[PDB]
C-alpha cells in the first residue's frame, strides 16, 4: 500500500485487572527437532523475539539421542534439543512470549516448557498450632 | 401481531390492515415490529396519494404513542426507505422523520442516511451526513446499512466533486 | 491437546526458610528422606497423582502444611529419642 | 471387561512391516532415516 | 445551517424473528477473508484452533472435583466391615484408587459400590 491505507487500526483491549500476577523465576523451553537447522532458525527467532520484549534469555544444546531399531534393514531417529532459559519475567510477558513462539513453532518440532512459578509461604505455616 | 408480520411480508397489505383494526377491537396492544409492517403496508396500498398515505402514517404514529410503544430504528428506517417511493414530495418529511429520529435520542444508522441519499438523488445533503459521520466507528444495526457506501459513491460519481 | 504427563507439579522449599525449632528439622528431613537433600537444603516434594495441575498443586501444599504441622508435633514415643 | 479386573482383584505404528518399510523406504515416515 | 437543526415531529421525547433478525444483521459485516491471520482469528473463535500459550488440560475440568476426593476415598467404606479381612482388602483397593490419576471420581465411587454389592451377596 502506498496511498490506500487504513485510517485507523483498532487495537485489541488489554485491561489492567486488579489481582496480583503470577512471578516466574526460570521458563526453560526445551524444543526437540529431527533437523538441526530448523532448530537453529527457531533459536534465531527465539532469542530476537526476547530482546525486542526486554526478557533475559540464555541458550544452550542438550545432547542429541537417536533410537536405532532393525527389522537386515536398519532405521534410524534422531533427536537434537535446543533449551532456551528466560530469567526473572512476569505472568504476563511469559505469556505473551510464549503464544507468540509457540503460534510461530516448525513442523516437526515439539516443544517442552517448564515455569517455575515464585510463592509465599501460606500463613497455616508462618507460626505452629497452639 | 404475528399475523400482521407475516401478512405484510407476503404483501398482503388490505387484510393486514383489517386484521389489524380487528386487533383494536379486541382492545389488544401491538408489537414495535407489527407497526412497522403497518406502515409499510399502508405505503404499499394501491390507488392513494401521497398526503393520505403520510396523514395515515402519522395516524399510526398516534396510536403507538397510544398504546406506549416507543419507535425504535427499524420503525423510522421503514418511514424513510417508503418515503423513498414518493419523490420530491417526501424530502421535508424525511428530514423531519431524521430530526425525530435524533430528538428521541435514537442514533441513526448507515441505512438511514443510504435511505435520505437515494431519496433525494433522483444532493448537497451529503457535506452535512459526511460532516456528521466523519471518524465515526459503526456497528451493525440495520440490514440495509451495506447499501450506504455504494449509494454515496454514486453522489460523488454524480456531482463528479473528488474530495467527497 | 491432551498430555498425561502435564497434571506433574513439583514443590521446591529450602528448609531453612521454614521456622523449625532443631527437633521439628531433624523430624522433617527424617520423615522426608530422599525428597530432601543435604548438600542443597532444599525439599522437593513432587505431586502426580491428581488428574488435573491445580489439584497436585493444592495436593502438595497440604502435604507440605500437615508435614510442618507434624513434624512441629511431639508425641508420646517421641519422648524414647 | 470392568468385571474381569474387579473379580481378578477378588483372588510403535501398528503398520505390517512391509507396509511400514514402503512408507519408511518412500520417505513417508517422518524421521525415519537409513542408518 | 446544517440539516440537523430545524423543525421535528416533535411527538415524543427520550421468538423466531428475533433470531433470524439477528441472523440478517449478522450479513451486514459478512464479508470475505482478507488474509491469514483473519483465517485463524476466525477458527479461533469457532472453535477450530488450539488456545495458545497451550494448556493440556484445556477444555477438561474432572467435574469440577477437588484432590481431597481423589486422595481421601476411605469415607466410601463405612458400610463395609470395620475390623475384618474386608476393612484390609477395602482398604488397600482404596490405596490403590487414590493413586489413579486416569479416573474421575464417579468411576471410583462407582468401582467401591461395585464391591459393596459383591461383598453382599457373598
Not at chain 2, 64 to 69: E, I
Not at chain 3, 22 to 47: M, N, S
Not at chain 5, 80 to 98: A, Y
Amino acid at each position: 500500500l502506498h496511498v490506500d491505507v487504513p485510517k485507523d487500526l483498532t487495537k485489541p483491549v488489554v485491561t489492567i485487572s486488579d489481582e496480583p500476577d503470577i512471578l516466574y523465576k526460570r521458563l526453560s523451553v526445551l524444543v526437540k527437532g529431527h533437523d538441526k537447522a530448523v532448530l537453529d532458525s527457531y533459536e534465531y527467532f527465539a532469542v530476537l523475539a526476547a530482546k525486542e520484549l526486554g526478557i533475559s534469555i540464555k541458550v544452550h544444546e542438550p545432547p542429541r539421542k537417536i533410537e536405532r531399531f532393525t527389522l537386515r534393514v536398519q532405521y534410524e531417529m534422531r533427536t537434537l534439543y535446543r533449551c532456551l532459559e528466560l530469567e526473572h519475567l512476569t505472568g504476563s510477558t511469559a505469556d505473551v512470549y510464549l503464544e507468540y513462539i509457540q503460534r510461530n513453532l516448525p513442523e516437526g518440532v515439539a516443544m517442552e516448557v517448564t515455569k517455575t512459578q515464585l510463592e509465599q509461604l501460606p500463613e497455616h505455616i508462618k507460626e505452629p498450632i497452639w | 401481531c404475528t399475523m400482521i408480520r407475516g401478512m405484510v411480508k407476503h404483501r398482503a397489505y388490505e387484510q393486514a390492515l383489517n386484521l389489524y383494526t380487528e386487533l383494536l377491537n379486541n382492545r389488544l396492544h401491538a408489537d414495535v415490529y407489527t407497526f412497522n409492517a403497518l406502515i409499510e403496508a399502508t405505503v404499499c396500498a394501491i390507488n392513494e396519494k401521497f398526503e393520505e398515505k403520510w396523514s395515515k402514517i402519522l395516524e399510526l404514529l398516534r396510536h403507538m404513542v397510544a398504546q406506549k410503544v416507543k419507535p425504535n430504528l427499524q420503525t423510522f428506517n421503514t418511514i424513510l426507505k417508503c418515503l423513498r417511493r414518493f419523490h420530491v414530495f417526501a424530502r421535508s418529511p424525511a428530514l423531519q422523520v431524521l430530526r425525530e429520529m435524533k430528538a428521541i435520542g435514537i442514533e441513526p444508522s448507515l441505512a438511514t442516511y443510504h435511505h435520505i441519499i437515494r431519496l433525494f438523488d433522483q444532493s448537497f445533503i451529503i457535506y452535512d451526513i459526511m460532516n456528521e459521520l466523519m471518524g465515526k466507528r459503526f456497528s451493525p444495526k440495520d440490514p440495509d446499512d451495506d447499501k450506504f457506501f455504494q449509494s454515496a459513491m454514486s453522489i460523488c460519481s454524480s456531482l463528479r466533486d473528488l474530495e467527497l | 491437546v491432551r498430555n498425561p504427563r502435564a497434571r506433574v507439579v513439583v514443590l521446591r522449599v529450602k528448609l531453612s526458610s521454614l521456622n523449625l525449632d532443631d527437633h521439628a528439622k531433624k523430624k522433617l528431613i527424617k520423615l522426608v528422606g530422599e525428597r530432601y537433600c543435604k548438600t542443597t537444603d532444599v525439599l522437593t516434594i513432587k505431586t502426580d497423582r491428581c488428574p488435573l495441575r491445580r489439584q497436585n498443586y493444592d495436593y502438595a501444599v497440604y502435604l507440605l502444611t500437615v508435614l510442618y504441622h507434624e513434624s512441629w508435633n511431639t508425641e508420646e514415643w517421641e519422648k524414647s529419642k | 471387561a470392568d468385571e474381569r479386573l474387579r473379580i481378578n482383584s477378588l483372588r510403535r505404528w501398528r503398520l505390517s512391516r512391509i507396509v511400514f518399510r514402503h512408507l519408511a523406504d518412500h520417505g513417508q515416515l517422518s524421521g525415519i532415516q537409513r542408518a | 445551517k446544517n440539516i440537523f437543526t430545524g423543525k421535528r415531529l416533535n411527538i415524543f421525547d427520550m421468538s423466531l424473528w428475533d433470531v433470524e433478525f439477528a441472523k440478517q444483521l449478522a450479513t451486514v459485516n459478512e464479508q470475505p477473508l482478507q488474509n491469514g491471520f483473519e483465517e485463524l482469528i476466525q477458527w479461533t473463535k469457532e472453535g477450530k484452533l488450539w488456545e495458545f500459550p497451550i494448556n493440556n488440560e484445556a477444555g477438561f475440568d474432572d467435574d469440577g472435583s477437588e484432590f481431597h476426593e481423589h486422595i481421601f476415598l476411605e469415607k466410601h467404606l463405612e458400610s463395609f466391615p470395620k475390623q475384618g479381612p474386608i476393612r484390609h482388602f477395602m482398604e488397600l483397593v482404596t490405596c490403590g484408587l487414590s493413586k489413579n490419576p486416569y479416573l474421575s471420581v464417579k468411576q471410583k465411587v462407582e468401582h467401591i459400590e461395585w464391591f459393596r454389592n459383591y461383598f453382599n451377596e457373598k
